């Protein structure tokens, strides 16, 4: 049942997404990130790897609706 | 023409829920309706459909009535909501067709150039992937019969679609998914031998039955022609692998080496990191 929940979060958010630019990490599990239009939003980061893929500045794909960091 | 078809569980239930209609009110025959197909390519796809009142007498086994007033106006109702959706043929739950079905298909050929009938199954039993698909063509015959209309079997495969898995895949909830890599392939190995060797035993028993009675089918020739394709290697005792023996373990070469090599490193990751982390918390707690 937990592995079934792991398959869930592995799919999510799947597709589609929108390209954005990461600005900085304000705290853990959430950070501010800009979109392609340059819209800085408050977004919960994905809980798998919070370190090596976060980066000081990087181009990140954000969800179509939630604009989530994955 | 039509090579393969795609039948969705949504249109299939549209045959099943109508079995609850004529099932409680009776009486004879089966569920028969007009099939709404979708053709984006040579492969055929079916999304929705509509069930029509239908009756077939026994005596009088050739008597059948479609309702064209229900076939006409409701098509315009569905044409208005869905433009690409159109009737590709008819269907029924069988399980076994009758010779009268030549008249049902030939009457509706004015609507569509080729009507594809779909035999479905309301209660799944045996032996495998359910329902069926038939296409209407004319192969004449080799014996000299007049031009003969016999429905040829069409391979049918189930398919999915977006937004239709919401309630469908939720209601089951009892299946374990998938799980690829452990039980998924090994279960089918017990099934591919079961389902593979029972239809084997079922067909070889029918091939022996052809000697006693039932000739024709002669067939001809598809029975032995396709059997000899299976006979490229029989395989018979023992396996005739003298050339494939040293190659056999040679296929197990990389498999065993990747096993032992990686498992030794996986052990080095499992044993080391565990003893470290365990000795840390254990002795520093008290």
């Amino acid at each position: 049942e937990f592995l079934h929940a792991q398959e869930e979060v592995k799919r999510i958010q799947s597709i589609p997404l929108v390209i954005g630019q990461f600005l900085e990490a304000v705290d853990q599990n959430t950070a501010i990130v800009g979109s392609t239009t340059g819209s800085n939003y408050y977004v919960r980061i994905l809980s798998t790897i919070d370190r090596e893929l976060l980066k000081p500045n990087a181009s990140v794909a954000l969800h179509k609706h939630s604009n989530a960091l994955v | 023409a039509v090579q393969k078809v795609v039948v969705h569980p949504l249109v299939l239930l549209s045959v099943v829920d109508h079995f609850n209609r004529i099932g409680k009110v009776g009486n004879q025959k089966r569920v028969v309706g007009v099939l709404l197909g979708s053709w984006q390519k040579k492969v055929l796809d079916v999304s929705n459909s509509f069930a029509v009142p239908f009756d077939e007498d026994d005596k009088d086994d050739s008597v059948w009535f479609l309702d064209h007033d229900y076939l006409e106006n409701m098509y315009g109702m569905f044409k208005k909501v869905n433009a690409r959706e159109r009737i590709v043929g008819w269907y029924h739950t069988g399980p076994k067709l009758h010779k009268n079905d030549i008249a049902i298909n030939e009457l509706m050929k004015r609507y569509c150039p080729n009507s594809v009938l779909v035999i479905i199954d309301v209660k799944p039993k045996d032996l495998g992937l359910p329902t069926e698909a038939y296409i209407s063509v004319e192969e004449v015959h080799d014996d000299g019969t007049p031009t003969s209309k016999t429905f040829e079997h069409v391979t049918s495969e189930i398919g999915a679609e977006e937004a239709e898995e919401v309630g469908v895949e939720h209601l089951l909830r009892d299946i374990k998914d998938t799980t690829v890599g452990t039980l998924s392939q090994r279960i089918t190995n017990q099934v591919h031998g079961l389902k593979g060797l029972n239809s084997k035993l079922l067909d070889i028993r029918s091939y022996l039955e052809k000697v006693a009675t039932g000739k024709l089918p002669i067939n001809h020739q598809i029975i032995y022609q396709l059997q000899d394709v299976f006979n490229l290697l029989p395989d018979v005792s023992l396996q005739e692998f003298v050339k494939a023996f040293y190659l056999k373990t040679n296929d197990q070469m990389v498999v065993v080496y990747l096993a032992s090599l990686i498992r030794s490193v996986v052990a080095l990751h499992n044993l080391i990191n565990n003893k470290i982390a365990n000795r840390d918390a254990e002795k520093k707690e008290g």
């Binding site: - | 299939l12 549209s14 189930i158 919401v166 392939q185 089918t188 990686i262 499992n270």
Partner: protein, 278 residues
């Protein structure tokens, strides 16, 4: 007067036309009609759902055609069961499926035509498989402001329906409206074959046909080697030494269990040689 908690009995044949007519109108919102029978006050059943024409200019109350229903009900007479109409529904694929300004306008129009006319909404985007999604709501009379606003009894399904509370604007629309619980009467006859028909066609297509193999092992042994040395530098980073770096950090997962299943795949895939043959 007396009001009791209402329960929605849905048929699996009705649930299909919901999302299928909703997928056809995607992205735009459609306007449908619910079909069923009223058993009593505390329970309601929807035994059928039929498709209605989409509105490309936007949803309006004129989208529902009365002569369209008179001929549809006439077609239900020759059909096995000619049940009477009950209520309406509309899809909302473009957003979180909340009742819009048009949805409330057709409420008082349909609640005069039919007794209940329970509003049902659905959206494809919220989930894929393991969520019911959809939506359900019913208009409570705004003239009741003089009377009490807090029915019904049987707080079980009321408290569970109030949660999760589904964001905000949905509860912001709780003014003049109240939700209603949805349960599934047993389809298990067809629901048993629904799991059977889906998995039988999803297992190797015959369960035979699938038995990328060794070429994926060269790709696997790349993920069993090249990914290993980069993951095994971190235990060297665990030794500082000692100790100037932030601890603890657990680098064990998840690749170790991936290498476990990787060899489980290749060993049981090598068994295909000895299974099919003898």
């Amino acid at each position: 007067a007396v009001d009791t908690a209402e329960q929605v009995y849905i048929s699996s044949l009705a649930l299909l036309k919901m999302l299928k007519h909703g997928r056809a109108g995607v992205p735009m919102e459609v306007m449908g009609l619910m079909l069923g029978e009223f058993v009593d006050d505390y329970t309601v059943r929807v035994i059928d759902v039929f498709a209605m024409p989409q509105s490309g200019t936007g949803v309006s109350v004129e989208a529902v055609d009365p002569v369209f229903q008179a001929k549809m009900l006439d077609m239900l007479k020759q059909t096995g069961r000619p049940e009477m109409v009950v209520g309406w529904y509309h899809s909302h694929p473009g957003f979180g499926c909340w009742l819009s300004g048009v949805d409330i306008n057709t409420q008082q129009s349909f609640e005069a035509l039919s007794e209940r006319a329970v509003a049902v909404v659905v959206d494809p985007i919220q989930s894929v498989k393991g969520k019911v999604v959809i939506d359900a709501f019913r208009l409570i009379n705004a003239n009741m402001m003089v009377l009490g606003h807090e029915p019904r009894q049987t707080t079980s399904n009321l408290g569970h329906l109030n949660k999760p509370s589904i964001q905000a604007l949905i509860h912001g629309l709780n003014r003049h409206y109240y939700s209603i619980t949805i349960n599934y009467r047993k389809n298990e006859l067809e629901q048993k074959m629904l799991l059977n028909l889906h998995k039988k066609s999803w297992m190797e297509g015959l369960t035979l046909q699938d038995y990328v193999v060794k070429e994926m092992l060269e790709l696997a042994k790349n993920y069993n080697k090249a990914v290993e040395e980069e993951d095994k530098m971190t235990p060297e980073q665990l030794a500082i030494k000692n100790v100037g770096k932030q601890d603890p950090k657990r680098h064990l997962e998840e690749h170790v269990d991936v290498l476990m299943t990787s060899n489980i795949v290749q060993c049981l895939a090598a068994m295909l040689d000895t299974v099919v043959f003898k």
